[PDB]
Amino acid sequence: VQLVESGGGLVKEETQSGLNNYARVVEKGQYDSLEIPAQVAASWESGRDDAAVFGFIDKEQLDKYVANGGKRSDWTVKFAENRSQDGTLLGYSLLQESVDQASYMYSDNHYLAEMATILGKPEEAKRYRQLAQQLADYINTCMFDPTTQFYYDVRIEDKPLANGCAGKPIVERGKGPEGWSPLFNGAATQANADAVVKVMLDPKEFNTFVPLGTAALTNPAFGADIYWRGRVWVDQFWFGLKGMERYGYRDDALKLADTFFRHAKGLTADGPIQENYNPLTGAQQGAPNFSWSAAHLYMLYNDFFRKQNADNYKNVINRTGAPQYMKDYDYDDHQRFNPFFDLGAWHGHLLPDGPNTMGGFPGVALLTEEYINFMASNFDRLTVWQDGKKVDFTLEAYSIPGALVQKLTAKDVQVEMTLRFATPRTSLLETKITSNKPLDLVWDGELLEKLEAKEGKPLSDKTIAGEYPDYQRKISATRDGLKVTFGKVRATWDLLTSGESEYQVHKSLPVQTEINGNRFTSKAHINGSTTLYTTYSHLLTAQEVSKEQMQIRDILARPAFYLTASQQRWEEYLKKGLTNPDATPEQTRVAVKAIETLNGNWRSPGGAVKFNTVTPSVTGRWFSGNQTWPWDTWKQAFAMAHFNPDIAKENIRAVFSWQIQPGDSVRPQDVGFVPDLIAWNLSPERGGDGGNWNERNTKPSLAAWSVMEVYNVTQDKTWVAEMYPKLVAYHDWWLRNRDHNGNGVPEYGATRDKAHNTESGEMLFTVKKSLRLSCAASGRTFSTAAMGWFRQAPGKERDFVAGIYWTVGSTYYADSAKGRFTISRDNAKNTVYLQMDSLKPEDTAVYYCAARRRGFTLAPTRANEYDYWGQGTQVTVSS
Ligand SMILES: [Ca+2]
């Protein structure tokens, strides 16, 4: 007896259009078979990818939810188009008003009124106070649930409730951090706040090992490892504490801060700052050198941590390493080393790991427009020779805020190396050699060969050069050092170069330099103690290569000036930043890690971005170059206000510099909109070749809060005057384009976009193609008896799908197959079929045919009741 399955594999997709067609599919019962690009983008606009509140819940969680009394349809989020009175297409909204977004809008209004007051505009202040009070009434009437004493999003139902609310609170999707958003933002009444704080401090809800995670323990879609449905983020934790303090519970906030300090793993160690924590174990996850984590850790230092010159802070972050791959990635594709970047520069350096890399600063990290890529292991590494024997050194190497230092000590030679940044394109190394005898010096370097590793293991046998033939890396000796030139590479997702970018080495000492393919050696002879100065410059355009030469000449002429400028700027960061007298040494050191992190993620202007900016992570797979987000920015600038206010202001400016103005070429219906993602390269719709520039959605709005924080530390009236109209245009944009029911209470949404609609304005959506599986039986005919389909997901039981039985060919289906799957038989062919329509990712599994010859009383539906099995066939359905 043999059963042979056929017809599996990756299921294909088909694009459809039309909001009317979409509604007909929802009506049919088949919501779960749809992917709508605009709705995916609205989840990006919320800033919480797969939060429970937006309908995201996995199969096993949903089964349990139903077993507890709930319906699967309780997780469906409907979607609508937003049109003006003219009929113009404005965008799209979730049919759901979010309490965190209502509270942000409350804050927007509150801070805008303060700004109008500062600016002597009392009637505008009156408008903004009125809008705030209206929003607070809606939030406290509509979004607060008296039974569960907490806040939730509401649906936009077919008609409003008797009291005017768009719909009932979505209590059944469970509690999340959005519940304390009214407290943080100050919209909550005192009674409602008291109720919320009690839930926050409940050990059954949020008061976990690391408290205030992204879903309460009681949330049906909670998982301790899910980014947005259980894990703890520093922003929402801090919002939580601030909200508590706002309504009289500073004492308890202080207790939670202490808990967090004791339990968040690695806080007092030397690893990079990451994204989030498991609420049960405190284990860390996410991109290293993560800006908004640094920002909120700094704000916690400032507000909540307490006891219960750059030399004082060595090795706060481990910056050692010896990369062997251009993309030497961790498990989540982030660079697994922590290079030192300063001054907004576009290249960075590591400390030598041991004597193998000693005498150099290994792993030149290059920021190639939008990505971080390692160029070399050793590059310009010094070795010292006497009579043809290499001098043996002891290594000591450390980082401090603003510098890398290495000291090499031998019996009769000492070398002291100090690396600091000099301009936003140039770093400067001082190499001080002490010797009473002549020496031969040798510098060596090698460009990397291997492309990609993940967790130290090569992903393939691919080479940099094989993968990117346009890169054309070439080392040349120069007048006063060496350069590496690069070809034009437009690898949208990986590596971006102009064709005119260069990495230049200039030295104060004359050296003779030999190139041997991807290697170089430079030699010089010295007759005793010598100090030399070396500049390293990553230059991204012909104009930059040109402009930097004069600067490079200046740095080599005035090295003491530039080294001192760096040391003193960093003394100012620590002096302004370390303002908590009641902090322990360990807490203070956490603040210094945050300062180093944020200043590392600062980029100088580049390509389309005309201002200094700060990105979520210089080492991040998708967060590097000068890629800038609004949401990350507001948080970054709130904290950078307190230690580097000039870059705080720049960061906010960079984001507003691409705000939509009347007469815009792409989206004139979006005046006041702030794009989700700006970067070096403009989108093709704007005449560039960039793939990251994103205007399909914005992010939640903490812009007024962030601008006001810069005012609270500077009291600069010209700053408020500058920002206030940009803030007003953005505020107004939400009310034109993200308010489907026009009640003045925003929804998360998406813009009209090439990704979202056809030229004529018909909303795009995607459905999977039908897939048919077949099972050819060999040996005994089963048309009298039983044939069935089972499935099993990775590490799960074999679960019944559908069966066909007896002469008459009666059928039976799993509830999850009903409506979608159709089993059938060709008795002549001894073959059974399964037609699978309305597939969804939950259906990914190995599918097995099975058969039973022996008589049965009732149609067999359980694995152990079948007697023959095919080998299985994988079907994959991806989102
Ligand atoms: Ca609304």
Swiss-Prot record:
Residues at the catalytic site: D49 (proton donor), E275 (proton acceptor)
Region of interest called Linker, as start-end residue ranges on this chain: 539-584
Residues reported to bind Ca(2+): E97, D739, N741, N743, V745, E747
Keywords: Calcium, Glycosidase, Hydrolase, Metal-binding, Signal
Region (A domain), start-end ranges: 12-769
EC id: 3.2.1.-
Domain of life assignment: Bacteria
Tagged with keyword NAD: no
GO biological process assignments: DNA damage response; oligosaccharide catabolic process; trehalose catabolic process
Coiled coil: none
GO MF, one annotated term: metal ion binding
One Gene Ontology CC term in the entry: glucosidase complex
Gene3D superfamilies according to UniProt: 1.10.287.100, 1.50.10.10, putative glycoside hydrolase family protein from bacillus halodurans (2.70.98.50), Ribosomal protein L30p/L7e (3.30.1390.40)
Chain intervals for the UniProt region annotation (N-terminal domain): 309-539
InterPro entries reported in the protein's UniProt record: 6-hairpin_glycosidase_sf, 6hp_glycosidase-like_sf, Glyco_hydro_37, MGH1-like_GH, YgjK_N
Biological role stated in the UniProt entry: Glucoside hydrolase that cleaves the alpha-1,3-glucosidic linkage in nigerose. Has very low activity towards maltooligosaccharides, soluble starch, nigerotriose, kojibiose and trehalose.
UniProt-listed NCBIfam families: PRK10137.1
Family of this protein: Belongs to the glycosyl hydrolase 63 family.
Protein name: Glucosidase YgjK
Annotated organism of origin: Escherichia coli (strain K12)
Gene designation per UniProt: ygjK
